[PDB]
Swiss-Prot record, chains A, B:
Taxonomic lineage from the root: Eukaryota, Metazoa, Chordata, Craniata, Vertebrata
SUPFAM superfamilies, A to Z: GST C-terminal domain-like, Thioredoxin-like
Residues recorded with modification Phosphotyrosine: 2, 197
Effect of residue 6 to F: Reduces catalytic activity about 50-fold
Subunit structure: Homodimer. Interacts with CDK5.
Annotated protein name in UniProt: Glutathione S-transferase P
InterPro entries for the chain: Glutathione-S-Trfase_C-like, Glutathione-S-Trfase_C_sf, Glutathione_S-Trfase, Glutathione_S-Trfase_N, GST_C, GST_pi, GST_superfamily, Thioredoxin-like_sf
Binding site for glutathione: 6, 12, 37, 43, 50-51, 63-64
One Gene Ontology cellular component: nucleus
Record note on what altering residue 103 to V does: In allele GSTP1*B and allele GSTP1*C
Protein family according to the UniProt entry: Belongs to the GST superfamily. Pi family.
Amino acid sequence: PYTVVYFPVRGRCAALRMLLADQGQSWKEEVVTVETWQEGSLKASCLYGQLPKFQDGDLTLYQSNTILRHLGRTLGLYGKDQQEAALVDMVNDGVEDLRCKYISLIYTNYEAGKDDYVKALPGQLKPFETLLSQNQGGKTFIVADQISFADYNLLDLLLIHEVLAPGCLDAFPLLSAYVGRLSARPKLKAFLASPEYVNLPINGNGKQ
Amino acid sequence: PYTVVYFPVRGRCAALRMLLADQGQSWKEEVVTVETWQEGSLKASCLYGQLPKFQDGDLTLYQSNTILRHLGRTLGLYGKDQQEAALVDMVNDGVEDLRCKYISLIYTNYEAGKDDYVKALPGQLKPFETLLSQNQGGKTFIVADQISFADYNLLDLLLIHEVLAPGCLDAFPLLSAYVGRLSARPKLKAFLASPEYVNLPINGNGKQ
Ligand SMILES: N[C@@H](CCC(=O)N[C@@H](CS)C(=O)NCC(=O)O)C(=O)O
Ligand SMILES: N[C@@H](CCC(=O)N[C@@H](CS)C(=O)NCC(=O)O)C(=O)O
C-alpha cells in the first residue's frame, strides 16, 4: 500500500520509516541511485525536483513533513484534539528547523563549521527538554500521552545528533530517558537493529 | 481572541494576517521593537527564542506554520478530507522551502546573490503553476475548491517575489490570474490596501 522513493540513505526518510515500522505497517522501498538521479527524468517529474516521493495507493506525495503529517492523520498519531494537534505541529516545526541546520552543516561546511555547531547544540536541544519537562514530567511522549509523528521525527533528530556529537544528551536527562524508552519499543527496536536501517548511511556525502 | 506578537515587519506573519483578515477574524497586534528584543527577556521566554508568538485564548503557539495549520484546522481551511489535507501540506511545505531561500537571500547576501536567485526563480515558481493547472484548470484555489491556509501563504510568497523581481509571474498565466483573484476578495483587498499592511516593510533589514 505504501511506497518510499528515496536515495540509499536514512536522511529525511528515517523518521517516517521508524513510524511505519513501529506502527507495523508494510511498505516498499524504491531505491534511486545517484547515477539514476543524474540522468534527469525522475527529478524533472518530481513536483519540487526532489525526493522523498511517497505513494499511498494512487496518492502521490512529496515533502518529508507532508508524508509524516499524512501518516500522522491516517494512523492516529496526531493528538486527540485540535489543541494537541497544534502542539504536535509546534514540536515538528522545531525539529525541522534544527534538521535544516544539521543538513546545512553536513553538506555545506562540515569541516569549518562543526566546532561552532556543536558549541551551539545545547541551546538548540534545550527546548525539547523543556517540552518534555512540562508534559507528565517527561515519562511519556513529546505531546500529551500517546505517540505522535513528531516523536519519530524528534527521535531521529536526537539519534543523529548523538552520532555527530557523542554525549550531547548527557546534559538532558529527560531527552536521554526519552530516547532510551522509545528505542526500546519492540517493533522500533527490531527495526533500528535491522540491516535495512543499519546498513544505510545517515547522509549521502559520507559525513555524520 | 487572537494575539500576534511580532517585529514591525510583514515577514512570517503576512500570510497569517491575510488569512485572519480574509476570514473576518479580529486580533491584537503586539509589536516588539528590535530594542525591546535586544533586552533579552521576551526572547528567553520564547520556546525556540524566536517570534512570531501567537495566542488563541490561553493557547500559546510559536512557529509561523504551526499558527497557519492551527487556524487552518479551527477555521476549516485545510481541505475537505485527509487526502486534501495532505495536498494542502505539500503546497505549504513547498512554499516554506522557497520562503527559506528568499529569507537567506534577503538577509545573507542580497548584493552578490540576487542575480543567480532571480535566474533560478522560474524553475522555483513553476511547480505552483503546475499544481494550479492540475486543479480544475487553476480556476479556484491551490488545492481543490475551497481556500486553505496554503493559499494565503502561497499568495504572500508570490506577492513578495513580484517586488523582488517585477514580472516574474508574466510567464505563468495561472499564478497571475490566481494572484489577481485572491487579491480581489473584499476583506483581503481592503486589508492589503490598509496602512497596517502597506506601511510595514516586507523584511527587517530594508531589503526587498
Ligand atoms: N523540503 C524537502 C527537502 C527535500 C530534499 O532536500 N531532497 C534532497 C535529498 S534529502 C534531494 O532530492 N536532492 C537532490 C536534488 O535536489 O537534485 C523535504 O523535506 O522532503
Ligand atoms: N521557523 C520559525 C522561524 C522564526 C524566525 O525566523 N524568527 C525571527 C524573525 S522572522 C526571529 O525571531 N529573530 C530574532 C532572533 O532569532 O533572536 C517560524 O517559521 O516561525
